């Protein structure tokens, strides 16, 4: 029994609200608001806690990292990252929380940090080949993938994808996506890595592509119902949920999900209390 948790984001104002979707009841409720306005953060579930990593508070990019205990319904801080980091991705690999890329107001970042919950310490990880802002991250089969993004220096959206091996501590390019996607939602389902939506310039994509590490190849799947950049993604009971994001007009309050066995996207009838892009999304136990 799972709750999908949606944390902060931009509405377009940076917000504190955290909402959870209850799959049995098919409805949203609010839980404890974030300690601060936070959008453009990484978000993972780890050791029973939701971690909101970095991002933007409406004025400044931040290095703060806050964790939510859903049994207590309370936010508390963990160690700050070395670097202020926004539009990053975050994922858990081998019990460590990786904070990948982003932007700090001045430059985009190839830098990567890893958090050890036992010692409450972040440490330096090998950097990516490319500096990627608005990057999406997912872990499949012991490897961590950094998908697309925006290359600040080149002022363009990226089609390239890279993969991190923790044993060798290096990032290597893998097969490119079919198209450039900054702000792609990235999620994993049945050992496939999905890249949903994103954008190349001001037009927002509804297209979706899936990567198989066994073939090192991408292929198209069904388009989403809405164009979405900077949507959150998670996987629940065989289905890939895409939450909010920006459609080129508004921050969406809608959620839709992909059924890989029918190659169909279905819009959830109940919307969030607020539209959100650049919101954290993860799944916890109810
Ligand atoms: Na930013």
From Swiss-Prot:
Kelch repeats lie at residues 3-48, 49-95, 97-142, 144-191, 192-238, 240-286. It is found in: Cytoplasm, Cytoskeleton; Cell projection, Ruffle; Cell projection; Cell projection, Lamellipodium. Ubiquitous. Detected throughout the brain. Substrate-specific adapter of a BCR (BTB-CUL3-RBX1) E3 ubiquitin ligase complex that mediates the ubiquitination of target proteins, such as NPTXR, WNK1, WNK3 and WNK4, leading most often to their proteasomal degradation. The BCR(KLHL2) complex catalyzes ubiquitination and degradation of NPTXR. Responsible for degradative ubiquitination of the WNK kinases WNK1, WNK3 and WNK4. Plays a role in the reorganization of the actin cytoskeleton. Promotes growth of cell projections in oligodendrocyte precursors. Component of the BCR(KLHL2) E3 ubiquitin ligase complex, at least composed of CUL3 and KLHL2 and RBX1. Binds actin. Interacts with KLHL12. Interacts (via N-terminus) with FYN (via SH3 domain). This is Kelch-like protein 2.
């Amino acid at each position: 029994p799972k709750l999908m948790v949606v944390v902060g984001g931009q509405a377009p104002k940076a917000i504190r609200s955290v909402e959870c979707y209850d799959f049995k009841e098919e409805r949203w409720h609010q839980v404890a608001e974030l300690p601060s306005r936070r959008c453009r953060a990484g978000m993972v579930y780890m050791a029973g806690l939701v971690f909101a990593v970095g991002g933007f508070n409406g004025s400044l990019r931040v290095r703060t990292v806050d964790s939510y205990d859903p049994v207590k319904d309370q936010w508390t801080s963990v160690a700050n990252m070395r670097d202020r980091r926004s539009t990053l991705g975050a994922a858990v690999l081998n019990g460590l929380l990786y904070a990948v890329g982003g932007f700090d107001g001045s430059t985009g970042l190839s830098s990567v940090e890893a958090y050890n919950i036992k010692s409450n310490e972040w440490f330096h990880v090998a950097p990516m080949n490319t500096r990627r802002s608005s990057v999406g991250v997912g872990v499949v089969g012991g490897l961590l993938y950094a998908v697309g993004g925006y290359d600040v220096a080149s002022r363009q959206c990226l089609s390239t994808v890279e993969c991190y091996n923790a044993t060798t501590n290096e990032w290597t390019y893998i097969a490119e996506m079919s198209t450039r996607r900054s702000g792609a939602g990235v999620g994993v389902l049945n050992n496939l890595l999905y890249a949903v939506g994103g954008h190349d310039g001001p037009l927002v994509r509804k297209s979706v592509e899936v990567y198989d590490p066994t073939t090192n190849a991408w292929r198209q799947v069904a388009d989403m119902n809405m164009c979405r950049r900077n949507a959150g993604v998670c996987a629940v009971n065989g289905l890939l949920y895409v939450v909010g994001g920006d459609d080129g007009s508004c921050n969406l309050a809608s959620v839709e999900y992909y059924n890989p066995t029918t190659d169909k996207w279905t819009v959830v009838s109940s919307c969030m209390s607020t539209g959100r892009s650049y919101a954290g999304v993860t799944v916890i136990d109810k």
